Design a protein around this ligand. Sequence first.
Ligand SMILES: Nc1ncnc2c1ncn2[C@@H]1O[C@H](COP(=O)(O)OP(=O)(O)O)[C@@H](O)[C@H]1O
Ligand SMILES: Nc1ncnc2c1ncn2[C@@H]1O[C@H](COP(=O)(O)OP(=O)(O)O)[C@@H](O)[C@H]1O
Lengths: 513, 513
Amino acid sequence: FTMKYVGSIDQGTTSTRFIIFDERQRPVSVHQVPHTQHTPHPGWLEHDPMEIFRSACKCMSVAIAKLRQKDASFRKIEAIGITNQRETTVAWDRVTKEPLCYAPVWNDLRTYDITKKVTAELGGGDSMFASKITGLPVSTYFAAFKMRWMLENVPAVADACRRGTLCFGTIDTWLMYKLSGGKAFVTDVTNASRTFLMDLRTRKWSPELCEKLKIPMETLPEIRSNSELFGYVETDECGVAAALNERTPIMGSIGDQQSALFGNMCFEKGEAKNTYGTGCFLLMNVGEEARFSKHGLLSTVGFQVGRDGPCYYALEGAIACAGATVEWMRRNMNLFSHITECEKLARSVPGTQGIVFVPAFSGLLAPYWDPSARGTIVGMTLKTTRAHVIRAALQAIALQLNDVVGSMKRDAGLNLSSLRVDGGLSKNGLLMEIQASLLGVDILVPSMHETTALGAALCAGLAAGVWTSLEEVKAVSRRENSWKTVSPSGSAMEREAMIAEWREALKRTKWAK
Amino acid sequence: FTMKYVGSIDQGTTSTRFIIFDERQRPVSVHQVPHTQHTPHPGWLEHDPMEIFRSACKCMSVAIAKLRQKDASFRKIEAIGITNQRETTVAWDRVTKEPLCYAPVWNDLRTYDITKKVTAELGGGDSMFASKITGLPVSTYFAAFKMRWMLENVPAVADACRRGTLCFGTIDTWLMYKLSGGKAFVTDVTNASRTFLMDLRTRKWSPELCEKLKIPMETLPEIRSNSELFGYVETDECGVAAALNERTPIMGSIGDQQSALFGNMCFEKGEAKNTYGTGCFLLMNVGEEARFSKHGLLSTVGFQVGRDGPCYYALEGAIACAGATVEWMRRNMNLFSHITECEKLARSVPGTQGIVFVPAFSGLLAPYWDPSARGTIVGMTLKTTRAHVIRAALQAIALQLNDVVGSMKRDAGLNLSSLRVDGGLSKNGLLMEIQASLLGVDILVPSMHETTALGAALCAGLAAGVWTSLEEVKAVSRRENSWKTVSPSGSAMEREAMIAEWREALKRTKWAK
Ligand SMILES: Nc1ncnc2c1ncn2[C@@H]1O[C@H](COP(=O)(O)OP(=O)(O)O)[C@@H](O)[C@H]1O
Ligand SMILES: Nc1ncnc2c1ncn2[C@@H]1O[C@H](COP(=O)(O)OP(=O)(O)O)[C@@H](O)[C@H]1O
């Protein structure tokens, strides 16, 4: 009997990937293609939508070709899931099927002025005014503000609106449009919760905000769950349709951070995950009911398996410099050269012995939202070494997540039961130990590291009946994909010293303007 | 007649040199011999005074013997000058002519408890209570608290005192006693100003202070100028009378920092010198009347040519971590490897792009005495690099000296005229330019950088008629020895911003206890 496979498009900030999974939840074929990171003005970032689409189809046709060399009795993929960098917004025309301009990216800062024009003229000052509707504060990140900026500052967008041709879309929507030939204009609830145009509880567009923010709802896609029929792959860009060999349904769509939650099996309330990439995104599943935030955290959709399946919600927090800190220490400061020296140097000392290092190189986020904070070290003596500084960096990442989790527990009214961790810094043993001690929960480290791409494939597979239930999903995961477990081992008194010391350091970090 | 030669004994903390200078102020023969650093308990440091005496003597014989080989016009040394690590205190017996113990060194900390007692019981809790007599605060450095400690803790010393055979003396006193056979029990004004027993205004021992501190005046040597006949070399230790050949008078004695003030030609009020060593010692000639400091700067005697000749007073400030910071950056943090790269990396960026590095590794000194301050860096971004950090360390050193100078100008009622520089860290071209720019004066860098030894040689040679006036000395320097002049090359707008950022940074440095 023949292996069924499920494809996952992982459309990230810096690259695109197609991972083909089998029924074991094993990546059996992968391919990656990068796209250009345009930076026209300092603080701006922008992607070519056609470069992304092409990257995605190039990825698919290559991975398929490789899989069929290792399984010549293959023939088709059961379904395809999409997961994506969120918030990043693309505008296109619906007759040409072509982008009107380059897509500003989640962390672009051009929408700043509009951030403020909005908060004042609509919010009556309160940045969290619309938050009980959307889940989100007003920031540069969210899609609506980028939709707005384009409408205001892009000739071809301004026009295309008046002509009744304008389509807006997060990357999922863009992928699904172009992948289906123009046939589907859709989004999923996770991506939709990032627009600042969607009512969290109801998971439908808010006409208040659309007409309030100057956004014609004719320019907005239909919302669905993460797990159902969205469309079929109709295009043929890089022989993609021919390589699929049968008409293939797109049955999965889910934002990248939620995809990692789902992919690490964080299905029940209290279960949470952290992705240590360049930064950190921590997400906690908080149950079937939406929770909102006294400490400036985000409230968002975790996932919804099926049209009127239950919708799980989550809280979300972030640190801006995690992996970037470690890389900064080698590339900027020459504190080590090979990647494994970081943990090696940090273990070589017993502690930080007085120093604290707050790696707030582009501000504190999270529950102490402070853009004036900069990178800071205190307590050095002539005994301090690069080893102490590196250890101190790792403690500091952990200490930020500690404060984030503290916040989520009070805003959610639950305990964190366990913490799943993925990303480059997932592989730093000492960091996961310090992390476990501070939170006082186990940190599970998946050795099938591809968990973001897995999330989308699970949504796709659940909808195509490759997996029948979440328990079948969890069970296959346990048979097939191992994990290291990192238990806490601190002591109430040490933790308190570390946090007290940390709390004093934070007061000395304010610096810019 | 023939070529004249003056010799200089430079008795430092870690070694002793003998430099022979010719009439052009050229060092023509040099030898160096170390002496043992005994540390009985942490924070304690002690020198073997007989080892010091022998080193000086070996230094002399070797330097002279080398010079006879390399210079057929060298007949004898016209006179010898002495310069010394100040404060270090020797106790010895006037009949055995030997020490009663090792000599606690200037940076020795065993006098800490005696220091707290003196403040509380003699000064009502004011450390500055005697500072209008001595120009000094109560501190572990000064000679009187070391005497006091030897009586209270050394049975032999207390014994010798009981028997009327006790001689206390700073290193100048000890060297002139031993070099003369035991016939001279003298000290120059500059070293005496470092005892906490001398009255700045009279340049005599202060009966009140000796009585209040219970150092019998009988134990102290006679106070003389820096330049006059102290006596004659008579010992034949290490063949030194053999090497000198003829009768050689000792005609110069002056404390090391002051010697550098003198050797740098700072003969007028408003002329200052800075030594850029492990730390920095900055002195300014304040003119013929003492100036007391409303900023914790120390008031001291600059110099005095001739028994009851005009006496030039000085203000003194220190920084603890100068070249030590350069060294920490290399040895502890791996920011560069060869010392040339320090200046190269700092040159490679136009400024510090807003970071400040306060290297208060061992507290803050200068006019912000704060032993709780620790090493700190603020303001970093992911654009910051080691080049920025190295350059900030250099800026930090110049900013401290800018604050010290500023304090001096307010205490003295005068402008800084120019700054002569020496020490290893004055080979750093960029540190010199930053310093000209911040201070708005020319920085003169002697090519003949042996300024400390030259002070003593000048005192001696003036007294011997090798040079007949301060103006002849200045001319000879100019005609014979290269001075490099470093003019300001900054803007007053940058200066201002650098200073404002320095001030903000200093507020963030408090950490210890
Ligand atoms: N236990 C299994 N049952 C069925 N097919 C398998 C099994 N293990 C591997 N495969 C198949 O072999 C091909 C390559 O898979 P891969 O995991 O790279 O194999 P390996 O485990 O030898 O590295 C895929 O088609 C995959 O589905
Ligand atoms: N050529 C050079 N360039 C830059 N820095 C130097 C150079 N040579 C020595 N240094 C640094 O300057 C300091 C020189 O100190 P030094 O003058 O030797 O000690 P002291 O404090 O006893 O005068 C050292 O700490 C060293 O790091």
